[PDB]
Design a protein around this ligand. Structure first.
Ligand SMILES: CC(=O)Nc1ccc(CC(N)=O)cc1
Length: 435
C-alpha cells in the first residue's frame, strides 16, 4: 500500500478491525520506512479511540481530545478531517505527508470531501500515497454488507412522529436500540415520546456528539436517538438499530439560498453504516436492523459537494492548479473548477466566517465573495422579506451591535443557520456581533 502514487481503499466490512488491527500495522510499517504520515479521524471521539489502538506507537496527537506528552520526534501526525482541511486553508505550514490515511473515509461533511480531493490529487500527481479506510466507499450500492455476526434485517414502518399505538415492537424490546432520525427536531419529538413511555433516551447530533456520546458509557440507556453523525465510527453496545432511512439534503436553489430538502432516502453507504452499528459481536448473533424506507443517491446535487469545491478552490496545491474531488464522488456537483477561488483578503474573510463565525461553507462564501468584512453584520438584516427567519411563528429579532432591535432577515438565507433552536441561537449571536 505504502508505495508513492498508490491510493488504496481498505473496504473491509464494518467491525472487521480496520481501526484496531490494520491501522497499527500500517503505522508501524510507515515509521520503519520513515514516511511522514497523517492519520485523519472524523471526530475527537474517534481520535481518542485511535490513541488506544496506537498506544505505545510514536504518534503526535494534534487534538486536545488526547492527553499524552509527546517525545517531540514523532513523524506520524493524527488530527481530525476538518483540522486537516482547516490548516490547508490557513496561512499555516502543513507537511506534504508521504502517506495519507483517512479513517471513516465515507464521511460526507464538506471538509472531509475536500480532504479526499486534496489527498487523491497529490496521489495522482505522483507525490504521495493514501489509504481510505471505509466499509462503504463512494458510490457503493450495497446497504447490507457482511458483519461479525448475523443480523436480522426487517423492512417495517418506523415512526417519525410521536405515536400512541401501532408500533408496539418499538417499546416492547428489552435491549438497547440506536435509532437514526433525519434531523435534531425529529429526534426531539421521538425522544420525548419514548421518555413519556418510561424509556431512558440519549440524543446525539454533530454539535453535542463529544459531550453526549460519553453518556452512552456512563449511564444506563434504552435508546440513543441520533442523526447521521453516528455513521462515522460511533460504537455502541446495542442489539438493535431502528433506521428511518431518512436524512435532510441541503440544496442550493437558483445559486441564491440553501434549503434543507426532504426528509428523503439515505444513500446505500449511509444505510450500511447505520446498520453496521450492530452485528459487531461474533458471540451475539441476531442483532436486529429495522428499516423504514429504501435507499437513493441523495448525495447527487447535495450542497456538501459544492461546498467541498468552494474549500478546494481556496487551497494552494501548486502554482494556479486546483485539486479535483476524489473521482468516485466528482459527479455529485456541477461546479466550474476554480469558480470559487478568492483573492487573499476575501479568502481570509471566508476562513474566519467558517472558523470563528461557525457559518456553513456556502453562506461564508457568499458573504466573503461580496467583499464584506468578518465583523460587518449589516447583511444579516437587509435581505428580502421571504428571507425572514422565524422563531415560535413570529420573525426572529436580535439587538444589533448598535443596540437597535431588528428582524433577522439575512441577505443570503441558508436553512442550516436555523434548522433547530441551538442553530438559531448561534446565528442570533452572530447577527448581534457577539463573535
Ligand atoms: C452556490 C453557488 O454560488 N453556485 C452553485 C454552483 C453549482 C451548483 C450545482 C451543483 N449542485 O453542483 C449550485 C450552486
Amino acid at each position: 500500500m505504502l508505495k508513492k502514487k498508490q491510493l488504496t481503499v481498505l473496504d473491509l466490512h464494518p467491525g472487521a478491525g480496520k481501526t484496531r488491527r490494520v491501522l497499527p500495522e500500517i503505522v508501524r510499517e510507515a515509521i520503519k520506512k520513515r514516511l511522514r504520515t497523517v492519520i485523519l479521524a472524523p471526530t475527537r471521539v474517534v481520535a481518542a479511540e485511535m490513541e488506544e489502538a496506537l498506544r505505545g506507537l510514536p504518534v503526535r496527537y494534534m487534538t486536545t481530545a488526547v492527553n499524552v506528552t509527546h517525545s517531540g520526534t514523532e513523524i506520524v501526525d493524527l488530527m481530525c478531517h476538518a483540522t486537516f482541511t482547516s490548516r490547508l486553508l490557513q496561512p499555516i505550514r502543513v507537511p506534504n505527508y508521504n502517506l495519507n490515511i483517512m479513517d471513516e473515509a465515507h464521511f460526507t461533511d464538506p471538509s472531509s470531501i475536500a480532504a479526499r480531493g486534496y489527498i487523491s490529487t497529490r496521489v495522482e500527481m505522483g507525490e504521495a500515497a493514501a489509504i481510505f479506510m471505509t466499509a462503504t466507499p463512494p458510490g457503493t450500492r450495497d446497504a447490507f454488507p457482511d458483519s461479525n455476526s448475523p443480523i436480522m434485517d426487517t423492512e417495517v414502518e418506523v415512526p417519525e412522529r410521536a405515536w400512541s399505538s401501532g408500533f408496539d415492537w418499538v417499546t416492547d424490546h428489552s435491549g438497547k436500540t440506536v435509532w437514526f432520525v433525519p434531523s435534531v427536531r425529529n429526534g426531539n419529538e421521538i425522544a420525548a415520546c419514548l421518555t413519556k413511555a418510561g424509556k431512558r433516551v440519549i440524543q446525539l447530533s454533530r454539535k453535542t456528539f463529544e459531550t453526549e456520546f460519553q453518556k452512552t458509557k456512563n449511564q444506563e440507556w434504552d435508546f440513543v436517538i441520533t442523526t447521521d453523525i453516528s455513521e462515522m465510527g460511533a460504537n455502541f453496545k446495542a442489539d438493535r438499530v431502528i433506521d428511518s432511512r431518512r436524512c435532510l439534503k441541503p440544496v442550493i436553489l437558483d445559486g441564491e439560498r440553501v434549503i434543507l430538502a426532504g426528509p428523503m432516502p439515505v444513500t446505500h453507504a449511509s444505510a450500511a453504516q447505520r446498520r453496521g452499528r450492530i452485528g459487531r459481536n461474533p458471540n451475539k448473533p441476531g442483532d436486529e436492523y429495522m428499516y423504514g424506507g429504501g435507499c437513493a443517491e441523495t448525495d447527487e446535487g447535495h450542497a456538501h459537494w459544492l461546498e467541498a469545491r468552494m474549500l478546494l478552490d481556496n487551497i494552494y496545491l501548486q502554482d494556479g492548479l486546483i485539486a479535483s474531488l476524489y473521482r468516485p464522488e466528482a459527479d455529485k456537483v456541477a461546479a466550474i473548477e476554480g469558480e470559487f477561488k478568492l483573492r487573499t483578503e476575501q479568502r481570509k474573510t471566508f476562513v474566519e466566517l467558517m472558523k470563528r463565525g461557525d457559518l456553513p461553507v456556502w453562506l461564508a462564501y457568499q458573504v466573503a465573495s461580496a467583499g464584506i468584512t468578518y465583523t460587518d453584520r449589516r447583511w444579516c438584516f437587509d435581505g428580502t422579506t421571504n428571507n425572514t427567519i422565524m422563531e415560535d411563528s413570529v420573525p426572529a429579532e436580535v439587538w444589533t451591535k448598535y443596540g437597535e432591535k431588528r428582524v433577522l432577515k439575512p441577505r443570503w438565507m441558508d436553512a442550516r443557520v436555523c434548522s433547530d433552536h441551538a442553530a438559531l441561537k448561534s446565528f442570533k449571536e452572530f447577527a448581534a456581533g457577539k463573535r
